[PDB]
Amino acid sequence: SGFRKMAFPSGKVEGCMVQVTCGTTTLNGLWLDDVVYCPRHVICTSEDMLNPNYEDLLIRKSNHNFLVQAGNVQLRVIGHSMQNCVLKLKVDTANPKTPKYKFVRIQPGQTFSVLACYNGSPSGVYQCAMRPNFTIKGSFLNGSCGSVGFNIDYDCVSFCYMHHMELPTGVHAGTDLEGNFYGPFVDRQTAQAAGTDTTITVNVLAWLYAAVINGDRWFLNRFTTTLNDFNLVAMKYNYEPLTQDHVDILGPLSAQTGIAVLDMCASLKELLQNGMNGRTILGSALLEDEFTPFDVVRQCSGVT
Amino acid sequence: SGFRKMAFPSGKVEGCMVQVTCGTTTLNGLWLDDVVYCPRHVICTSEDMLNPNYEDLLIRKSNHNFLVQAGNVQLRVIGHSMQNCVLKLKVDTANPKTPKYKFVRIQPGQTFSVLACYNGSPSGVYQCAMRPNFTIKGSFLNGSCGSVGFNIDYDCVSFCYMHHMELPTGVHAGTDLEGNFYGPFVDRQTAQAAGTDTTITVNVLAWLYAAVINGDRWFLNRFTTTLNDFNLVAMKYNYEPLTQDHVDILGPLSAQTGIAVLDMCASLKELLQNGMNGRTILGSALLEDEFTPFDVVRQCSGVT
Numbered sequence: 124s125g126f127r128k129m130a131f132p133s134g135k136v137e138g139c140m141v142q143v144t145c146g147t148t149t150l151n152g153l154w155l156d157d158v159v160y161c162p163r164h165v166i167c168t169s170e171d172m173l174n175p176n177y178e179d180l181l182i183r184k185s186n187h188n189f190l191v192q193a194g195n196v197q198l199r200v201i202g203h204s205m206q207n208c209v210l211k212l213k214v215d216t217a218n219p220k221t222p223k224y225k226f227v228r229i230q231p232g233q234t235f236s237v238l239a240c241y242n243g244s245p246s247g248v249y250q251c252a253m254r255p256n257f258t259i260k261g262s263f264l265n266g267s268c269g270s271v272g273f274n275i276d277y278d279c280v281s282f283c284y285m286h287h288m289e290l291p292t293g294v295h296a297g298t299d300l301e302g303n304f305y306g307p308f309v310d311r312q313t314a315q316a317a318g319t320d321t322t323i324t325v326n327v328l329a330w331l332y333a334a335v336i337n338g339d340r341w342f343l344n345r346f347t348t349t350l351n352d353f354n355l356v357a358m359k360y361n362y363e364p365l366t367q368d369h370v371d372i373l374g375p376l377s378a379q380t381g382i383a384v385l386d387m388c389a390s391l392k393e394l395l396q397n398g399m400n401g402r403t404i405l406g407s408a409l410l411e412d413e414f415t416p417f418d419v420v421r422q423c424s425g426v427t
Numbered sequence: 428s429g430f431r432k433m434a435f436p437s438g439k440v441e442g443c444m445v446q447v448t449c450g451t452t453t454l455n456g457l458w459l460d461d462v463v464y465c466p467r468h469v470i471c472t473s474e475d476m477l478n479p480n481y482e483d484l485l486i487r488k489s490n491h492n493f494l495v496q497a498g499n500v501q502l503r504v505i506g507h508s509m510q511n512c513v514l515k516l517k518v519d520t521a522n523p524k525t526p527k528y529k530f531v532r533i534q535p536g537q538t539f540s541v542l543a544c545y546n547g548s549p550s551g552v553y554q555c556a557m558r559p560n561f562t563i564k565g566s567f568l569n570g571s572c573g574s575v576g577f578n579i580d581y582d583c584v585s586f587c588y589m590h591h592m593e594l595p596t597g598v599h600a601g602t603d604l605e606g607n608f609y610g611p612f613v614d615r616q617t618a619q620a621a622g623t624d625t626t627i628t629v630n631v632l633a634w635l636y637a638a639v640i641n642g643d644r645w646f647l648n649r650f651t652t653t654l655n656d657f658n659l660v661a662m663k664y665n666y667e668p669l670t671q672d673h674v675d676i677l678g679p680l681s682a683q684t685g686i687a688v689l690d691m692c693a694s695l696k697e698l699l700q701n702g703m704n705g706r707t708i709l710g711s712a713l714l715e716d717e718f719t720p721f722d723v724v725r726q727c728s729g730v731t
């Protein structure tokens with residue numbers, strides 16, 4: 124029992140973190156096989172960020188201008204290319220610690236673990252989610268760029284995010300491991316507003332199911348609702364619309380607790396309309412939306 | 428910017444996790460050098476837990492009754508002893524992945540990372556704190572015993588906790604790596620009530636400092652208070668008394684923000700007396716107490 128914001132063990136990803144320096148800029152790189160993946164803004168100075176032309180800036184760089192350090196040993200760069208907003212630095216040594224891996228592009232509402240790094244060294248691990256506005260509410264300081272987001276399925280590490288940016292609003296933006304930004308963000312130091320940060324309804328429902336499993340049942344009411352009625356209330360409260368795909372995805376949690384999905388929706392509806400009244404659910408005073416139904420099942424079953 | 432409940436990278440501790448089986452009971456062990464540390468209740472059946480006499484139960488066990496598996500390879504047990512509530516299983520192979528380590532006994536209010544394990548395999552990592560009542564609010568299922576709590580200082584892993592128990596209240600109890608329980612808990616399946624779970628005031632103040640650094644300043648008021656006046660309010664709200672040692676420990680955060688410790692105490696006092704009014708601080712609707720002043724500084728500075 125007990126329910127925690129849990130991240131995947133970071134060991135497999137720590138073994139991939141390297142330091143990439145280009146000129147006076149230093150950030151993190153991900154070393155998988157004989158390729159080092161890093162944000163392309165490693166080639167920029169702070170002044171360049173206002174209006175960078177990456178292709179032109181890259182012309183003035185050669186393999187030897189990219190310094191890659193794994194531990195206290197330097198890696199030899201034998202090739203370099205730009206794929207969208209990431210640079211692929213081909214090195215002469217395959218990473219002996221390369222885990223089994225995939226590059227996946229996640230959807231909003233999907234959660235992942237981040238291994239925050241500075242100078243190629245891991246400093247911390249936390250769990251977060253891709254917000255519906257395509258931002259992540261991370262914890263990143265200057266130099267954290269190149270830190271990655273990932274999920275683990277037994278032994279396979281699915282890399283889904285690479286950190287690139289902090290918007291003026293203090294939220295974060297980044298790309299998948301192919302260099303494509305999540306959302307409409309660009310790697311320029313320019314006015315970029317995130318968009319409405321809606322609550323991930325399916326994740327809130329999953330977390331309400333986790334609360335019932337773990338004993339917090341005070342919020343359970345005697346009502347039920349329909350998808351349409353529930354969505355009228357969800358829209359008013361800046362909650363994402365709930366689909367039949369979401370109801371289907373909550374099926375196993377519905378079965379384990381004996382609580383139909385639409386009954387849990389009615390309980391959520393009253394929590395939105397009446398507030399918590401100074402009460403908590405799993406030690407939280409707000410409705411948590413950064414646990415997917417898969418995370419709730421994984422944590423409550425004990426997947427290793 | 429951004430502030431997250433961050434755990435230490437778990438890699439160094441993942442390399443120590445082994446599976447210990449005795450008879451029909453299986454739990455986790457910590458393999459450091461040629462010794463495997465595990466809860467002594469690995470020798471008990473579910474029936475034995477009601478009234479175990481560990482010394483007598485242990486007499487019927489020999490080195491060969493303890494099965495240690497690291498990965499898919501079995502380790503040879505060449506010696507066994509009971510130190511308080513942990514068993515030390517001497518194996519014939521020193522762990523090739525032993526990090527630099529210490530066994531420390533933490534105080535209440537101190538935070539640590541837990542690598543939750545099942546069958547010697549890591550399943551997740553989260554950050555928690557030793558509560559003032561000596562319980563931990565973890566996330567542990569049956570089979571999680573032997574999972575450890577730790578802190579990392581650069582390359583040294585300080586092991587501070589080993590999971591043993593879940594109290595009827597759903598909270599957790601465990602020992603330091605010498606087998607001594609935190610608090611008055613015993614490894615018996617018997618009625619054990621935790622005691623008042625007070626809020627760690629010094630940690631709440633540290634987190635209020637983190638909020639100011641990260642831009643959430645709405646709670647800052649025009650008042651100040653004294654340690655005695657503040658403590659009269661803190662007692663009423665089940666908050667731990669604040670000492671001059673705590674004020675001293677908050678000095679660097681006070682300096683970085685320009686906010687005197689007693690001014691932050693007055694802000695906290697009004698938050699306790701008036702509530703949040705539907706507002707949040709670092710995306711939380713309650714006052715967070717599981718970040719020490721050291722954690723706030725570490726996260727805000729970027730210690731690797």
Ligand SMILES: O=C(Cc1cncc2ccccc12)N(CCC1CCCCC1)Cc1cccs1
Nearest residue numbers: 148167168169263264265288289310311312428
């Ligand atoms: O946002 C960052 C990094 C960053 C990330 N997370 C958190 C940050 C916190 C503080 C400062 C910076 C942070 N950029 C890079 C900073 C420069 C450092 C020197 C060399 C040239 C880049 C600016 C842009 C990238 C893309 C579009 S604007």
Ligand SMILES: O=C(Cc1cncc2ccccc12)N(CCC1CCCCC1)Cc1cccs1
Nearest residue numbers: 124452471472473567568569592593614615616
């Ligand atoms: O509390 C646990 C483990 C546990 C921990 N965290 C979470 C748990 C969740 C569910 C069940 C159990 C949990 N004990 C061990 C369970 C037995 C399993 C079979 C063999 C004999 C022991 C009972 C006691 C230990 C000390 C005093 S009473």
